[PDB]
Amino acid sequence: EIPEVLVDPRSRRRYVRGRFLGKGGFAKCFEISDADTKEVFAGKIVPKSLLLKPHQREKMSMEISIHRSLAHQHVVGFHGFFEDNDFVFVVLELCRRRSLLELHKRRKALTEPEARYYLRQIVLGCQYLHRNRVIHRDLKLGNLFLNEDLEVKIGDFGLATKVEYDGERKKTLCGTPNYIAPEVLSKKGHSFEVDVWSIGCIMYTLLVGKPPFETSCLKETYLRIKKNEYSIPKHINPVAASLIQKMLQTDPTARPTINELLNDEFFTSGYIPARLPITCLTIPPRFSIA
Amino acid sequence: EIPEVLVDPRSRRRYVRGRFLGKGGFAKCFEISDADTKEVFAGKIVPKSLLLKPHQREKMSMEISIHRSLAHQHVVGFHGFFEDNDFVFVVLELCRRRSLLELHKRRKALTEPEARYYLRQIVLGCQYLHRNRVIHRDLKLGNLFLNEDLEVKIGDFGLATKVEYDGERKKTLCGTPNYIAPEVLSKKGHSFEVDVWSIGCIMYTLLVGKPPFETSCLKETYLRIKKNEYSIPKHINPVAASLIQKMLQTDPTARPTINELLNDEFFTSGYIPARLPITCLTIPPRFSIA
Ligand SMILES: CN1CCN(c2ccc(OC(F)(F)F)c(Nc3nccc(-c4cc(C(N)=O)cn4C)n3)c2)CC1
Numbered sequence: 001e002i003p004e005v006l007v008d009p010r011s012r013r014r015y016v017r018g019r020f021l022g023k024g025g026f027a028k029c030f031e032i033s034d035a036d037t038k039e040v041f042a043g044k045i046v047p048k049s050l051l052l053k054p055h056q057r058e059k060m061s062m063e064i065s066i067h068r069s070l071a072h073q074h075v076v077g078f079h080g081f082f083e084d085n086d087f088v089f090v091v092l093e094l095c096r097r098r099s100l101l102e103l104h105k106r107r108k109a110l111t112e113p114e115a116r117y118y119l120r121q122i123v124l125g126c127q128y129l130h131r132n133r134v135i136h137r138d139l140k141l142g143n144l145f146l147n148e149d150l151e152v153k154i155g156d157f158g159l160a161t162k163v164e165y166d167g168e169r170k171k172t173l174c175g176t177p178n179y180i181a182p183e184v185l186s187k188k189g190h191s192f193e194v195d196v197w198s199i200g201c202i203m204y205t206l207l208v209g210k211p212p213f214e215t216s217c218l219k220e221t222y223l224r225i226k227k228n229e230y231s232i233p234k235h236i237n238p239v240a241a242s243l244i245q246k247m248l249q250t251d252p253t254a255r256p257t258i259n260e261l262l263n264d265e266f267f268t269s270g271y272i273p274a275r276l277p278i279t280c281l282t283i284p285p286r287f288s289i290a
Numbered sequence: 291e292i293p294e295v296l297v298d299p300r301s302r303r304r305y306v307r308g309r310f311l312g313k314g315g316f317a318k319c320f321e322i323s324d325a326d327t328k329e330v331f332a333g334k335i336v337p338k339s340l341l342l343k344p345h346q347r348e349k350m351s352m353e354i355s356i357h358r359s360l361a362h363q364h365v366v367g368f369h370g371f372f373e374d375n376d377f378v379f380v381v382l383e384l385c386r387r388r389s390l391l392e393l394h395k396r397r398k399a400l401t402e403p404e405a406r407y408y409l410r411q412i413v414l415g416c417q418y419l420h421r422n423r424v425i426h427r428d429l430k431l432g433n434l435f436l437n438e439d440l441e442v443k444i445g446d447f448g449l450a451t452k453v454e455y456d457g458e459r460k461k462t463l464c465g466t467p468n469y470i471a472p473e474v475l476s477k478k479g480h481s482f483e484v485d486v487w488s489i490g491c492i493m494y495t496l497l498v499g500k501p502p503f504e505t506s507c508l509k510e511t512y513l514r515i516k517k518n519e520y521s522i523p524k525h526i527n528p529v530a531a532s533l534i535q536k537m538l539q540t541d542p543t544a545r546p547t548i549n550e551l552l553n554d555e556f557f558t559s560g561y562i563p564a565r566l567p568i569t570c571l572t573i574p575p576r577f578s579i580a
């Protein structure tokens with residue numbers, strides 16, 4: 001029941017609603033354009049009908065709060081927000097090549113160089129967030145968006161949280177992540193390290209072709225995560241495999257920090273493309289020399 | 291997109307679909323009638339479109355398996371099931387006075403005698419289930435249905451589980467109960483005692499007017515449950531309050547068993563109506579002597 005047109009009173013810019021793209025939890029998103037400057041954006045549109053509880057509106061506004069404070073090459077650009085009142089509208093940088101999830105659906109396991117290439121950007125993005133005291137808490141493939149140049153852009157700050165004082169441990173995470181860290185479950189509190197754990201799972205998934213703790217039942221996967229029960233297939237190279245293991249460890253203090261990661265042999269001693277062929281959306285790149 | 295009419299090939303009985311009643315998780319339920327004997331039932335109708343995964347179909351059939359094995363005055367009667375194939379149909383004893391949830395919405399805190407009356411039936415029902423080696427695992431107000439005589443009927447075996455050998459501890463519970471027990475969370479395994487815990491919360495809720503671990507956030511409530519953080523209001527009688535405390539304890543071995551419960555002073559030494567006025571759906575009964 002969403003307005004074909006979208007007016008921001010405060011900045012008066014007006015937007016035309018374009019094609020549907022997908023979900024946030026409560027949200028539906030569409031392409032939209034600035035109608036005057038004709039510039040195109042993603043609009044994440046949330047019905048106030050799902051926002052009747054103060055707890056849900058705090059989440060909604062905590063997301064805007066965190067996201068609009070952020071500016072970086074590997075984070076989804078926040079261009080603004082407004083509401084009438086059946087809807088909140090958020091205006092985001094449009095990522096024209098969907099996300100890493102669709103890439104994975106279509107390619108399954110990637111070539112090592114491809115994985116280095118994406119993982120670096122994910123890590124740079126995450127370094128920026130950690131400098132600004134933000135933990136994302138749900139890094140996964142469908143959150144890692146791609147622009148026309150196939151550069152990674154972290155988005156969906158729907159579960160992100162700000163560390164307000166040094167040493168703070170968050171005790172709750174209101175929602176259910178994909179790649180969720182041990183300590184979140186064995187609810188002893190969590191901090192920045194949960195994101196490095198996610199990046200471990202993502203790395204496994206990119207290289208192996210499926211996620212490290214998959215089962216027919218979520219609750220089973222959870223048990224498996226609490227027990228650190230996964231195995232790395234023997235055809236994965238050891239440097240890679242070793243880095244995965246560093247990140248996928250139950251004690252958060254033993255994982256690498258995020259600023260520490262790009263220093264790993266996995267990046268320093270392997271090839272990292274400067275850019276990828278658009279063909280790699282569907283065809284494995286061979287990375288020939290001439 | 292559900293058939294106005296419903297034919298069981300195997301027993302050939304045919305049903306007319308009547309008015310909508312509410313949800314199971316995946317299910318929608320309606321009144322329905324035997325069209326020939328004109329007898330009325332509740333039909334719990336589940337789209338096979340939500341049953342595409344083997345894990346979901348096991349749950350669905352585990353529920354039927356458990357539920358059709360059951361026959362008792364305080365359990366919802368199973369009359370049968372069949373499917374075409376966009377739907378599974380289950381035929382249940384119709385409870386003409388909705389559930390204890392709607393009662394609570396309308397009366398909030400009940401009189402002690404009313405609570406004894408309902409709690410006894412809930413407990414008899416649960417005793418039958420435990421003799422037959424079934425743990426319900428989601429006893430709550432909206433599961434406790436009422437027939438025209440205001441007798442309690444336990445229903446929704448959507449999360450119930452069978453104890454297959456003596457001493458078995460279940461490690462997972464696939465779903466998210468309302469009144470969920472500590473040990474389920476601190477995932478060290480659980481058994482029959484979780485139901486007595488639920489009955490503790492229900493008793494609190496019936497007597498107090500709201501549940502023992504309420505907060506604006508589920509995950510907060512969970513923490514509160516792990517810490518046993520609740521308090522009983524001082525206007526609740528001590529015998530009652532003491533029984534609540536017996537059930538709401540973190541160690542399952544310390545709670546009463548279900549066969550042990552009706553022996554508690556709370557029942558043995560207080561008044562228990564034989565039947566309730568229909569007026570008590572909306573008016574507090576005074577229980578006058580003449
Ligand atoms: C799981 N998939 C994730 C990526 N998807 C996807 C498909 C098409 C897209 O635009 C296009 F067509 F130009 F490329 C985009 N492009 C795009 N660009 C910027 C932001 C978002 C976005 C943010 C959120 C959120 N949870 O906050 C959800 N979405 C959507 N999506 C994303 C589809 C669903």
Ligand SMILES: CN1CCN(c2ccc(OC(F)(F)F)c(Nc3nccc(-c4cc(C(N)=O)cn4C)n3)c2)CC1
Binds near residue numbers: 387388389433
């Ligand atoms: C949360 N509330 C629980 C009880 N509700 C409710 C309202 C009207 C009703 O029938 C009538 F009209 F004759 F009284 C009934 N009557 C009724 N009778 C037998 C079974 C069920 C039932 C079982 C399940 C399940 N999860 O398996 C869901 N429902 C529904 N409901 C129940 C409405 C929703």
Ligand SMILES: [Zn+2]
Binds near residue numbers: 216218219220345464
């Ligand atoms: Zn499951």
Ligand SMILES: [Zn+2]
Binds near residue numbers: 510
């Ligand atoms: Zn919450």
